[PDB]
Design an enzyme around this catalytic site. Structure first.
Site, PDB file in Angstrom:
ATOM      1  N   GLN A   1       7.483   6.906 -20.371  1.00  0.00           N
ATOM      2  CA  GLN A   1       6.333   5.977 -20.261  1.00  0.00           C
ATOM      3  C   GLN A   1       6.297   4.932 -21.467  1.00  0.00           C
ATOM      4  O   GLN A   1       6.132   3.499 -21.185  1.00  0.00           O
ATOM      5  CB  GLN A   1       5.075   6.732 -20.285  1.00  0.00           C
ATOM      6  CG  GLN A   1       4.717   7.445 -19.167  1.00  0.00           C
ATOM      7  CD  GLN A   1       4.446   6.312 -18.041  1.00  0.00           C
ATOM      8  OE1 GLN A   1       3.426   5.680 -18.128  1.00  0.00           O
ATOM      9  NE2 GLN A   1       5.285   6.496 -16.957  1.00  0.00           N
ATOM     10  N   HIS A  42       0.654  -5.684   0.023  1.00  0.00           N
ATOM     11  CA  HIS A  42       1.850  -5.780  -0.518  1.00  0.00           C
ATOM     12  C   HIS A  42       2.624  -4.516  -0.411  1.00  0.00           C
ATOM     13  O   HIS A  42       3.889  -4.540  -0.672  1.00  0.00           O
ATOM     14  CB  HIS A  42       1.568  -5.839  -2.104  1.00  0.00           C
ATOM     15  CG  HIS A  42       1.616  -4.887  -3.071  1.00  0.00           C
ATOM     16  ND1 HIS A  42       0.162  -4.079  -3.022  1.00  0.00           N
ATOM     17  CD2 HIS A  42       2.065  -4.368  -3.923  1.00  0.00           C
ATOM     18  CE1 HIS A  42       0.214  -3.197  -3.774  1.00  0.00           C
ATOM     19  NE2 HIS A  42       1.279  -3.335  -4.358  1.00  0.00           N
ATOM     20  N   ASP A  43       2.380  -3.433  -0.060  1.00  0.00           N
ATOM     21  CA  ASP A  43       3.168  -2.161   0.102  1.00  0.00           C
ATOM     22  C   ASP A  43       3.055  -1.640   1.626  1.00  0.00           C
ATOM     23  O   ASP A  43       3.350  -0.453   1.662  1.00  0.00           O
ATOM     24  CB  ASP A  43       2.789  -1.108  -0.850  1.00  0.00           C
ATOM     25  CG  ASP A  43       3.481  -1.263  -2.400  1.00  0.00           C
ATOM     26  OD1 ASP A  43       4.466  -1.686  -2.381  1.00  0.00           O
ATOM     27  OD2 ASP A  43       2.781  -1.142  -3.455  1.00  0.00           O
ATOM     28  N   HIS A  98      -3.766   2.592  -3.435  1.00  0.00           N
ATOM     29  CA  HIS A  98      -2.968   1.803  -4.406  1.00  0.00           C
ATOM     30  C   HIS A  98      -3.199   0.311  -3.936  1.00  0.00           C
ATOM     31  O   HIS A  98      -3.658  -0.424  -4.672  1.00  0.00           O
ATOM     32  CB  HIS A  98      -1.557   2.010  -4.251  1.00  0.00           C
ATOM     33  CG  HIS A  98      -0.628   0.924  -4.799  1.00  0.00           C
ATOM     34  ND1 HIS A  98      -0.525   0.657  -6.213  1.00  0.00           N
ATOM     35  CD2 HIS A  98       0.208  -0.042  -4.478  1.00  0.00           C
ATOM     36  CE1 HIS A  98       0.097  -0.237  -6.416  1.00  0.00           C
ATOM     37  NE2 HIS A  98       0.822  -0.536  -5.374  1.00  0.00           N
ATOM     38  N   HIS A 109       2.103   5.280  -3.372  1.00  0.00           N
ATOM     39  CA  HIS A 109       2.009   3.832  -2.556  1.00  0.00           C
ATOM     40  C   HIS A 109       1.325   4.139  -1.254  1.00  0.00           C
ATOM     41  O   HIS A 109       1.869   3.981  -0.189  1.00  0.00           O
ATOM     42  CB  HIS A 109       3.413   3.711  -2.147  1.00  0.00           C
ATOM     43  CG  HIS A 109       4.120   3.295  -3.704  1.00  0.00           C
ATOM     44  ND1 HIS A 109       5.123   3.875  -4.240  1.00  0.00           N
ATOM     45  CD2 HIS A 109       4.125   2.041  -4.114  1.00  0.00           C
ATOM     46  CE1 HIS A 109       5.566   3.141  -5.271  1.00  0.00           C
ATOM     47  NE2 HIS A 109       5.130   1.896  -5.213  1.00  0.00           N
ATOM     48  N   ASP A 111      -0.039  -5.170  -9.726  1.00  0.00           N
ATOM     49  CA  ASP A 111       0.843  -3.952  -9.108  1.00  0.00           C
ATOM     50  C   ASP A 111       0.955  -2.907 -10.090  1.00  0.00           C
ATOM     51  O   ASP A 111       0.917  -1.635  -9.586  1.00  0.00           O
ATOM     52  CB  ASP A 111       2.039  -4.367  -8.859  1.00  0.00           C
ATOM     53  CG  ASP A 111       2.828  -3.662  -7.655  1.00  0.00           C
ATOM     54  OD1 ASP A 111       2.180  -2.449  -7.033  1.00  0.00           O
ATOM     55  OD2 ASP A 111       3.692  -3.765  -7.240  1.00  0.00           O
TER      56      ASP A 111
HETATM   57  C1  LIG Z   1       3.086   3.550 -14.686  1.00  0.00           C
HETATM   58  N1  LIG Z   1       3.543   2.762 -13.643  1.00  0.00           N
HETATM   59  N2  LIG Z   1       3.157   1.972 -12.970  1.00  0.00           N
HETATM   60  C2  LIG Z   1       4.034   1.333 -12.045  1.00  0.00           C
HETATM   61  C3  LIG Z   1       5.334   2.128 -12.346  1.00  0.00           C
HETATM   62  C4  LIG Z   1       6.576   1.937 -11.741  1.00  0.00           C
HETATM   63  O1  LIG Z   1       7.795   1.750 -12.265  1.00  0.00           O
HETATM   64  N3  LIG Z   1       6.723   1.475 -10.337  1.00  0.00           N
HETATM   65  C5  LIG Z   1       7.929   1.401  -9.652  1.00  0.00           C
HETATM   66  C6  LIG Z   1       7.029   1.879  -8.373  1.00  0.00           C
HETATM   67  C7  LIG Z   1       5.840   1.697  -9.077  1.00  0.00           C
HETATM   68  C8  LIG Z   1       5.163   2.832 -13.349  1.00  0.00           C
HETATM   69  C9  LIG Z   1       5.892   3.883 -14.261  1.00  0.00           C
HETATM   70  O2  LIG Z   1       5.538   4.968 -14.792  1.00  0.00           O
HETATM   71  N4  LIG Z   1       7.273   3.355 -14.642  1.00  0.00           N
HETATM   72  C10 LIG Z   1       8.207   3.924 -15.169  1.00  0.00           C
HETATM   73  C11 LIG Z   1       9.469   3.276 -15.680  1.00  0.00           C
HETATM   74  C12 LIG Z   1      10.672   3.864 -16.339  1.00  0.00           C
HETATM   75  N5  LIG Z   1      10.553   5.259 -16.671  1.00  0.00           N
HETATM   76  N6  LIG Z   1      11.472   5.859 -17.103  1.00  0.00           N
HETATM   77  C13 LIG Z   1      10.764   7.245 -17.175  1.00  0.00           C
HETATM   78  C14 LIG Z   1      11.582   8.427 -17.622  1.00  0.00           C
HETATM   79  C15 LIG Z   1      12.577   8.510 -18.254  1.00  0.00           C
HETATM   80  C16 LIG Z   1      13.245   9.645 -18.862  1.00  0.00           C
HETATM   81  C17 LIG Z   1      12.802  10.887 -18.564  1.00  0.00           C
HETATM   82  C18 LIG Z   1      11.380  10.944 -17.940  1.00  0.00           C
HETATM   83  C19 LIG Z   1      10.673   9.560 -17.649  1.00  0.00           C
HETATM   84  N7  LIG Z   1       9.405   7.433 -16.372  1.00  0.00           N
HETATM   85  C20 LIG Z   1       9.215   5.945 -16.182  1.00  0.00           C
HETATM   86  C21 LIG Z   1       8.218   5.323 -15.454  1.00  0.00           C
HETATM   87 MG   LIG Z   2       5.807  -2.279  -3.901  1.00  0.00          MG
HETATM   88 ZN   LIG Z   3       2.489  -1.693  -5.218  1.00  0.00          ZN
END
Ligand SMILES: Cn1ncc(C(=O)N2CCC2)c1C(=O)Nc1ccn2nc(-c3ccccc3)nc2c1
Ligand SMILES: [Mg+2]
Ligand SMILES: [Zn+2]
Length: 313
Positions: A269, A106-107, A72, A68, A217
């Site tokens: 993922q 935005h962040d 980004h 962040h 985003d």
């Molecule tokens: C790729 N990307 N881009 C933005 C975001 C995001 O969500 N945000 C919020 C701030 C930017 C993500 C991301 O990877 N999200 C996620 C969402 C859900 N899960 N659940 C796991 C998991 C569950 C169990 C064991 C291990 C891992 N991992 C993730 C990663």
């Molecule tokens: Mg944000």
């Molecule tokens: Zn962002």
């Protein structure tokens, strides 16, 4: 007035593409942003002296966190640029001004912690803003920088044009709260399918801009696999730090944030591409056909994560 920004040939070409990576040279990011404003908005939109001063104040109010961060901010702005450039005639003059600035801003002042962690920590910002805690903060910070002397990039707008652009930016930044994304997209889904989607309807435009903000985003998932994969390391670096801080409050963090549960990342993922990313770009592509390459890149990266699970990497 007659002073264009110009990029090297490879960047000049690749920057028009959705999957463009802004690269590791921080000193070039301001010039890249300005290049994008000038082709997106016009060389006449902002007083270059005030734009530059605003860009550098914004940079200064991003923190040295793994994900962040200033990189980004410029990445999310570049995605929005690509969306605007591929849908020339769909957006007003104010929207073009507002949205690149919204994306850059935005962040602002992000500490790498979720809204949940702030609420469980009982951070002052959680008493000031009960929902969309960090996103109300980011808007607040944007307004503060806008009011620094010599920082008002909007000063040649009328009083009500000015108010419209800050309302575009406020709604755009609030919508980056992924908690609001799910309902926003279901609505856009029903409206598009039943046939009631109306882009002269301001409530409808707000929703479509919200979806664009979510798409920009999340855009790490729409890059070439190596950019996507290395960006995921920064994303988890923040998540697992938050997980550690949760443990320090005597709360077991969700697996997403638990560094002990690394092995479950690939499956995590998948859930995320299936539940958030693919539906976001699916709905976006239905509303804005020329954004299809984001959908195509996302599906490519889902397939790459599937391969990680099958031990093929
Ligand atoms: C790729 N990307 N881009 C933005 C975001 C995001 O969500 N945000 C919020 C701030 C930017 C993500 C991301 O990877 N999200 C996620 C969402 C859900 N899960 N659940 C796991 C998991 C569950 C169990 C064991 C291990 C891992 N991992 C993730 C990663
Ligand atoms: Mg944000
Ligand atoms: Zn962002």
């Amino acid at each position: 007035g007659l002073m264009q920004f110009t990029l090297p040939v490879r960047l000049c070409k690749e920057i028009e593409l959705f999957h463009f990576d802004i690269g590791p040279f921080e000193n070039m990011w301001p010039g890249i942003f300005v290049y994008m404003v000038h082709r997106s908005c016009g060389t006449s939109c902002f007083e270059l002296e005030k734009l530059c001063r605003f860009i550098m104040s914004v940079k200064k109010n991003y923190r040295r966190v793994p994900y962040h961060n200033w990189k980004h901010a410029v990445t999310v702005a570049h995605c929005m640029y690509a969306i605007l450039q591929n849908n020339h005639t769909l957006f007003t003059d104010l929207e073009r001004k507002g949205l690149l600035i919204a994306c850059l801003c935005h962040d602002l002042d992000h500490r790498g912690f979720s809204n949940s962690y702030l609420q469980k920590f009982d951070h002052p910002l959680a008493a000031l803003y009960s929902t969309s805690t960090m996103e109300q903060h980011h808007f607040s910070q944007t307004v503060s920088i806008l009011q620094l002397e010599g920082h008002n990039i909007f000063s040649t707008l009328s009083s009500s044009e000015y108010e419209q652009v800050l309302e575009i930016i406020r709604k755009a930044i609030i919508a980056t709260d992924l908690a609001l994304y799910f309902g926003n997209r279901k609505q856009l889904e029903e409206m598009y399918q039943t046939g009631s989607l109306n882009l002269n309807n301001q409530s409808h435009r707000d929703r479509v801009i919200g979806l664009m903000m979510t798409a920009c985003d999340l855009c790490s998932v729409t890059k070439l696999w190596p950019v996507t994969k290395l960006t995921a390391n920064d994303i988890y670096a923040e998540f697992w730090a938050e997980g550690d801080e949760m443990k320090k409050l005597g709360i077991q963090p969700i697996p997403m944030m638990d560094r002990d549960k690394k092995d479950e990342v690939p499956q995590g993922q998948l859930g995320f591409y299936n539940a958030v990313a693919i539906p976001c770009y699916t709905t976006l592509t239905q509303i804005l056909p020329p954004t299809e390459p984001l959908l195509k890149a996302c599906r490519d990266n889902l397939s790459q994560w599937e391969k990680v699970i099958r031990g093929e990497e």
